[PDB]
């Protein structure tokens, strides 16, 4: 199946390329940069959402599923982009955002008017408690209550995300049919599949039970906010009614997923999705359940990363399918978050790339990952993300569960905007992203980190990623081999083995700044190896003992 063999490039289009000079990346901009993505080697593009939206959550609040936001272009531009992607032998996946809509969606504008409105039950309306307070103690992912009051009708509406993102009612068959109609519209026009936003959220516990509480917080985000009792029923219906009718790829953003939930989503026999994104490997550098959420930061712990990625490799080794990512439009640049983004930036980028791309599953490259883009030094007032603005107010100002200094530090590590400053094309004004004024400033380091210099440098991170993708296409063990964690207890080295029809692929990466030592286990000492890729000058190829330099990475194949 082409999706098992694919390498996906994720574009965040408001920040990819601005062709028309208004500082906002657009769909003609994407068209003009397709050749770049094909030369890198990705064969699937996932486009973050371009549908009409007031941009409260930068597109993830959709006000019209069947039209583009005007700054992206029109539907004609989107149709042309589909054609251009196809002419290049590539596939295009769109972002399906159907847990919620914008509150400016016509459905919601209607729903809120009156209880007798035909769109009332498209959304999730509940009575206040007797004292007027919220139906229950559920919180929003973007701080505060998950419920907002409507004075006109005397009820609260549910929003797991912003108050401008009211949740749809999947108990209503008309809502499910509307979704299906949206899916068909775009698939009939050549969309090759969907990344399904917050897909773990679509089924609610319709009794709306309160969480138990520790009194550490007023509003709680927990186990009711994902993996609802009808979740898989709904996805199986979506497959029967839609997905089974097209040659398509699906990847779910599966909030709340663990390895068993992943099997329910991804086992081919269940006729649901092809693969999901989990957050468990992204969760390893927060406390489990602080009131401060993801902002309660822990240092990078390689043993935790090994444990989690291994659990996922083994759990979907022979059933289901993994995604492989360290970056997207919600995560900081991995090298700044967990590594060295200064003197060892190249080595470190390549090392994280090698660990990820040597595993079983479909790899995802986030725009700019391939050139080693880094987190930004911009001051807090320059950040745009509502998540940060809301968390500052709740955690720092109101509840005082974090100090200002601790919050700023956490934002500088994990803010989503580190992913959203514009793609860095060259060393000219605004890194060549725009001839105008960009919607957010370009990262201050762009003159050193950009496509132009990367393509001039045979040692670039770019050429490394290009090579990793070629190797995947050349060596079917990379796609189909199994997985075994080696030297498991080593606190610096991430090493593992894949095996497929008598061949072996050995991946050894020092994820640390200091020297380390890899010694192959006894059963591999008499293997002969050919080095497929390394991020340091020398060979290769006596892999039974490797004195590892900082961030050294090597992949070998048995011969
Ligand atoms: Mg523009």
Curated annotation (Swiss-Prot):
<dbReference type="GO" id="GO:0005737">
    <property type="term" value="C:cytoplasm"/>
</dbReference>
<feature type="binding site">
    <location>
        <position position="18"/>
    </location>
    <ligand>
        <name>Ca(2+)</name>
    </ligand>
</feature>
<dbReference type="Pfam" id="PF16657">
    <property type="entry name" value="Malt_amylase_C"/>
</dbReference>
<keyword id="KW-0479">Metal-binding</keyword>
<dbReference type="GO" id="GO:0004556">
    <property type="term" value="F:alpha-amylase activity"/>
</dbReference>
<dbReference type="Pfam" id="PF00128">
    <property type="entry name" value="Alpha-amylase"/>
</dbReference>
<comment type="similarity">
    <text>Belongs to the glycosyl hydrolase 13 family.</text>
</comment>
<feature type="binding site">
    <location>
        <position position="24"/>
    </location>
    <ligand>
        <name>Ca(2+)</name>
    </ligand>
</feature>
<protein>
    <recommendedName>
        <fullName>Oligo-1,6-glucosidase 1</fullName>
        <ecNumber>3.2.1.10</ecNumber>
    </recommendedName>
</protein>
<feature type="binding site">
    <location>
        <position position="20"/>
    </location>
    <ligand>
        <name>Ca(2+)</name>
    </ligand>
</feature>
<feature type="active site" description="Proton donor">
    <location>
        <position position="253"/>
    </location>
</feature>
<comment type="function">
    <text>Hydrolyzes various disaccharides such as sucrose, maltose, and isomaltose with different efficiencies. Also hydrolyzes longer maltodextrins from maltotriose up to maltohexaose, but not maltoheptaose, palatinose, isomaltotriose, or isomaltotetraose.</text>
</comment>
<feature type="binding site">
    <location>
        <position position="26"/>
    </location>
    <ligand>
        <name>Ca(2+)</name>
    </ligand>
</feature>
<dbReference type="InterPro" id="IPR032091">
    <property type="entry name" value="Malt_amylase-like_C"/>
</dbReference>
<dbReference type="InterPro" id="IPR017853">
    <property type="entry name" value="Glycoside_hydrolase_SF"/>
</dbReference>
<dbReference type="GO" id="GO:0046872">
    <property type="term" value="F:metal ion binding"/>
</dbReference>
<dbReference type="InterPro" id="IPR045857">
    <property type="entry name" value="O16G_dom_2"/>
</dbReference>
<dbReference type="InterPro" id="IPR006047">
    <property type="entry name" value="Glyco_hydro_13_cat_dom"/>
</dbReference>
<feature type="site" description="Transition state stabilizer">
    <location>
        <position position="330"/>
    </location>
</feature>
<keyword id="KW-0963">Cytoplasm</keyword>
<dbReference type="InterPro" id="IPR013780">
    <property type="entry name" value="Glyco_hydro_b"/>
</dbReference>
<feature type="active site" description="Nucleophile">
    <location>
        <position position="197"/>
    </location>
</feature>
<dbReference type="GO" id="GO:0004574">
    <property type="term" value="F:oligo-1,6-glucosidase activity"/>
</dbReference>
<feature type="binding site">
    <location>
        <position position="22"/>
    </location>
    <ligand>
        <name>Ca(2+)</name>
    </ligand>
</feature>
<dbReference type="GO" id="GO:0009313">
    <property type="term" value="P:oligosaccharide catabolic process"/>
</dbReference>
<keyword id="KW-0106">Calcium</keyword>
<keyword id="KW-0326">Glycosidase</keyword>
<keyword id="KW-0378">Hydrolase</keyword>
């Amino acid at each position: 199946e082409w999706w098992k063999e694919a390498v996906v490039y994720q574009i965040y289009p408001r920040s990819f390329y601005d062709a028309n000079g208004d500082g906002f990346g657009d769909l003609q901009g994407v068209i003009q940069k397709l050749d770049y993505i094909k030369n890198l080697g990705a064969d699937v593009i996932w486009l973050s959402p371009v549908f009409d939206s007031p941009q409260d959550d930068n597109g993830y609040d959709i006000s019209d599923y069947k039209n583009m936001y005007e700054k992206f272009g029109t539907n004609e531009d989107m149709f042309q982009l589909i054609d251009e992607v196809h002419k290049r032998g590539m596939k295009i996946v769109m972002d399906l955002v159907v847990n919620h809509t914008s509150d400016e969606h016509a459905w919601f504008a209607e729903s809120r008017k009156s209880k007798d409105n035909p769109y009332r039950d498209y959304y999730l309306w509940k009575d206040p408690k007797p004292d007027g307070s919220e139906p229950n103690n559920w919180g929003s992912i973007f701080s505060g209550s998950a419920w907002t009051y409507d004075e006109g009708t005397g009820q609260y509406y549910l929003h797991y995300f912003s108050k401008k993102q009211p949740d749809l009612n999947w108990e209503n068959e008309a809502v499910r049919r509307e979704v299906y109609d949206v899916m068909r519209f775009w698939m009939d026009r050549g969309v090759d599949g969907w990344r399904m936003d917050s897909i773990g959220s679509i089924s609610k516990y319709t009794d709306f039970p309160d969480y138990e509480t520790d009194h550490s917080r007023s509003y709680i985000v927990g186990r009711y906010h994902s993996n609802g009792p009808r979740l898989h029923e709904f996805i199986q219906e979506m497959n029967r009614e839609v997905l089974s009718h097209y040659d398509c790829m699906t990847v779910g953003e599966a909030n709340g997923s663990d390895i068993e939930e992943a099997k329910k989503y991804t086992d081919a026999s269940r006729q649901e999705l092809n693969m999901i994104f989990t957050f468990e490997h992204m969760d390893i550098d927060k406390e489990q359940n602080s009131p401060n959420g993801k902002w309660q930061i822990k240092p990078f712990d390689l043993i935790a990363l090994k444990k989690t990625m291994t659990r996922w490799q083994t759990g979907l080794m022979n059933v289901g399918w993994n995604t492989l990512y360290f970056e997207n439009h919600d995560q900081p640049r991995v090298i700044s978050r967990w590594g060295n983004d200064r003197k060892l930036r190249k080595e470190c980028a390549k090392a994280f790339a090698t660990v990820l791309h040597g595993m079983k599953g479909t790899p995802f490259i986030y725009q700019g990952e391939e050139i080693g883009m880094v987190n930004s030094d911009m001051p807090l007032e320059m950040y745009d993300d509502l998540e940060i603005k809301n968390a500052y107010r709740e955690l720092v100002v109101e509840n005082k569960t974090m100090s200002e200094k601790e919050f700023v530090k956490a934002v500088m590590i994990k803010g989503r905007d580190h992913a959203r400053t514009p793609m860095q094309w060259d060393a000219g004004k605004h890194a060549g992203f725009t001839a105008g004024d960009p919607w957010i400033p370009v990262n201050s380091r762009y003159q050193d980190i950009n496509v132009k210099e990367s393509l001039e440098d045979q040692d670039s991170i770019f050429f490394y990623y290009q090579k990793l993708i070629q190797l995947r296409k050349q060596y079917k063990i990379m796609i189909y081999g199994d997985y075994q964690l080696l030297q498991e207890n080593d606190p610096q080295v991430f090493s593992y083995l894949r095996e497929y029809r008598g061949e072996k692929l050995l991946v050894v990466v020092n994820l640390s700044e200091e020297k380390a030592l890899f010694e192959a286990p006894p059963e591999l000492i008499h293997e002969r190896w050919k080095v497929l890729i390394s991020n340091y000058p020398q060979e290769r190829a006596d892999l039974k003992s490797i004195s590892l330099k900082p961030y050294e990475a090597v992949m070998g194949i048995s011969i």
